[PDB]
Design an enzyme around this catalytic site. Structure first.
Site, PDB file in Angstrom:
ATOM      1  N   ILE A 159      37.945  42.984  49.565  1.00 16.25           N
ATOM      2  CA  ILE A 159      38.106  41.574  49.986  1.00 16.25           C
ATOM      3  C   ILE A 159      39.569  41.378  50.383  1.00 16.25           C
ATOM      4  O   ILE A 159      40.479  41.816  49.633  1.00 16.25           O
ATOM      5  CB  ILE A 159      37.653  40.601  48.893  1.00 16.25           C
ATOM      6  CG1 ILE A 159      36.200  40.857  48.457  1.00 16.25           C
ATOM      7  CG2 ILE A 159      37.844  39.173  49.379  1.00 16.25           C
ATOM      8  CD1 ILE A 159      36.059  41.916  47.384  1.00 16.25           C
ATOM      9  N   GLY A 187      35.296  45.595  45.443  1.00 17.04           N
ATOM     10  CA  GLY A 187      33.938  45.486  44.883  1.00 17.04           C
ATOM     11  C   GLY A 187      33.164  46.780  45.019  1.00 17.04           C
ATOM     12  O   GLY A 187      33.697  47.747  45.619  1.00 17.04           O
ATOM     13  N   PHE A 205      30.645  47.614  46.843  1.00 18.39           N
ATOM     14  CA  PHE A 205      30.315  47.987  48.250  1.00 18.39           C
ATOM     15  C   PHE A 205      31.409  47.496  49.219  1.00 18.39           C
ATOM     16  O   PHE A 205      31.146  47.396  50.445  1.00 18.39           O
ATOM     17  CB  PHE A 205      28.906  47.508  48.636  1.00 18.39           C
ATOM     18  CG  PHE A 205      28.531  46.100  48.228  1.00 18.39           C
ATOM     19  CD1 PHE A 205      27.868  45.860  47.028  1.00 18.39           C
ATOM     20  CD2 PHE A 205      28.762  45.024  49.080  1.00 18.39           C
ATOM     21  CE1 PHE A 205      27.477  44.574  46.674  1.00 18.39           C
ATOM     22  CE2 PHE A 205      28.370  43.739  48.723  1.00 18.39           C
ATOM     23  CZ  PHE A 205      27.732  43.513  47.520  1.00 18.39           C
ATOM     24  N   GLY A 206      32.625  47.267  48.700  1.00 21.25           N
ATOM     25  CA  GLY A 206      33.878  47.272  49.486  1.00 21.25           C
ATOM     26  C   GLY A 206      34.839  46.161  49.073  1.00 21.25           C
ATOM     27  O   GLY A 206      34.607  45.510  48.040  1.00 21.25           O
ATOM     28  N   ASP A 245      23.685  38.781  37.506  1.00 24.43           N
ATOM     29  CA  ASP A 245      25.023  39.351  37.238  1.00 24.43           C
ATOM     30  C   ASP A 245      25.907  38.232  36.704  1.00 24.43           C
ATOM     31  O   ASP A 245      27.022  38.054  37.207  1.00 24.43           O
ATOM     32  CB  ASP A 245      25.570  40.039  38.492  1.00 24.43           C
ATOM     33  CG  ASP A 245      26.636  41.080  38.202  1.00 24.43           C
ATOM     34  OD1 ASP A 245      26.715  41.526  37.036  1.00 24.43           O
ATOM     35  OD2 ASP A 245      27.388  41.446  39.175  1.00 24.43           O
ATOM     36  N   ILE A 283      42.962  41.449  48.516  1.00 22.87           N
ATOM     37  CA  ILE A 283      42.996  40.579  47.304  1.00 22.87           C
ATOM     38  C   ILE A 283      42.006  41.079  46.249  1.00 22.87           C
ATOM     39  O   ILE A 283      42.126  40.600  45.133  1.00 22.87           O
ATOM     40  CB  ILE A 283      42.769  39.081  47.628  1.00 22.87           C
ATOM     41  CG1 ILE A 283      41.415  38.800  48.274  1.00 22.87           C
ATOM     42  CG2 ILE A 283      43.906  38.540  48.471  1.00 22.87           C
ATOM     43  CD1 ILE A 283      41.260  37.365  48.772  1.00 22.87           C
ATOM     44  N   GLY A 284      41.075  41.983  46.584  1.00 27.39           N
ATOM     45  CA  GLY A 284      40.054  42.438  45.613  1.00 27.39           C
ATOM     46  C   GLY A 284      39.300  43.670  46.079  1.00 27.39           C
ATOM     47  O   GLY A 284      39.252  43.905  47.276  1.00 27.39           O
TER      48      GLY A 284
END
Ligand SMILES: Nc1ncnc2c1ncn2[C@@H]1O[C@H](COP(=O)(O)O)[C@@H](O)[C@H]1O
EC number: 2.7.11.1
Length: 287
Positions: free
Chosen positions: A16, A11, A13-14, A121, A8-9
């Site tokens: 989702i 990032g 550092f990995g 962030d 689904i996503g």
């Protein structure tokens, strides 16, 4: 205990995934950290989420440790980001939707601060609406850049420091972040102020500004932001937006923000406009 479904996503550092918690019989989000490096980030992120447990609009997590070439973090499954929802609403939010959002977003940042962290962030990509029963709840995610700003026992504030480099996304960065100053609680709130004016405007005047090759990549963003008065940025919008940003910019490095002042400022505007506190957001009206 977990079954991994569709991605689904992705990032820094990995990735989702949709997942099943077989023991709980609940659908969950599963974050996989594949490339560890010498300084893996997922275990650290899980430790910050642990210290945030019990927070409304903070996803509940389960650190699961290693599986094969992956570190695993199981998370509360959440809905679309505020950036996704802004795009879906043709990059305009009504004042009512901006004020409903502002009320929760100040509280989410206050909660993080209460647990001795700054987020660092703050941007619409990192606020997700809940699903189902939690569809009216704003969550904050991505604690990858989060930092303790005080000792957990002493509440001794981190020292003043300058000459830092800006890394990552500058669009919502504070002016002091552009100036290389150590981030503190004020910076998270100034960022939220730029997020709220972004929702009002559709964009920010420094958005998408590129420097020349060989130059510091952020210099054109920094120059525009510092040369754009708050009163020019917020022209034509209720004065509360300018008031919010002036207040954030006025805070000293170690100051405790008056979160309640900022919430009540927007609440008074909400009442003057005759809006109902009904969680009926712009995206609820899409057909
Ligand atoms: N718990 C979650 N539930 C649903 N989507 C998520 C969740 N965490 C992250 N995402 C999405 O995954 C992508 C990267 O998230 P992250 O890199 O962890 O900040 C983005 O598209 C997020 O919207």
């Amino acid at each position: 205990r977990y079954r991994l479904g569709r991605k689904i996503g992705s990032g820094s550092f990995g990735d989702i995934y949709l997942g099943t918690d077989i023991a709980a019989g609940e659908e969950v989000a599963i974050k996989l950290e594949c490339v560890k490096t010498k300084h893996p980030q997922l275990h650290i992120e899980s430790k910050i989420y642990k210290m945030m447990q019990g927070g409304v609009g903070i996803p509940t997590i389960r650190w699961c440790g290693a599986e094969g070439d992956y570190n695993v973090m199981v998370m509360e499954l959440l809905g679309p980001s505020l950036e996704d929802l802004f795009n879906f609403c043709s990059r305009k939010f009504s004042l009512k939707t901006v004020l409903l959002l502002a009320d929760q977003m100040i509280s989410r940042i206050e909660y993080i601060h209460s647990k001795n962290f700054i987020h660092r962030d703050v941007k619409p990509d990192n606020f997700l609406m809940g699903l189902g029963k939690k569809g009216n709840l704003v969550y904050i995610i991505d604690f990858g850049l989060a930092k303790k700003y005080r000792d957990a026992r002493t509440h001794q504030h981190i020292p003043y420091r300058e000459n830092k480099n800006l890394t990552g996304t500058a669009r919502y960065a504070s002016i002091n972040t552009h100036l290389g100053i150590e981030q503190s609680r004020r910076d998270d709130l100034e960022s939220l102020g730029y997020v709220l004016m972004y929702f009002n405007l559709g964009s920010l005047p420094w958005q998408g500004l590129k420097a020349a090759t060989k130059r510091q990549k952020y210099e054109r963003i920094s120059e525009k932001k510092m040369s754009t008065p708050i009163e020019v940025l917020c022209k034509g919008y209720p004065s509360e937006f300018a008031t919010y940003l002036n207040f954030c910019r006025s805070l000293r490095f170690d100051d405790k923000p008056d979160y309640s002042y900022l919430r009540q400022l927007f609440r008074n505007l909400f009442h003057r406009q005759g809006f109902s506190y009904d969680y009926v957001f712009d995206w609820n009206m899409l057909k």
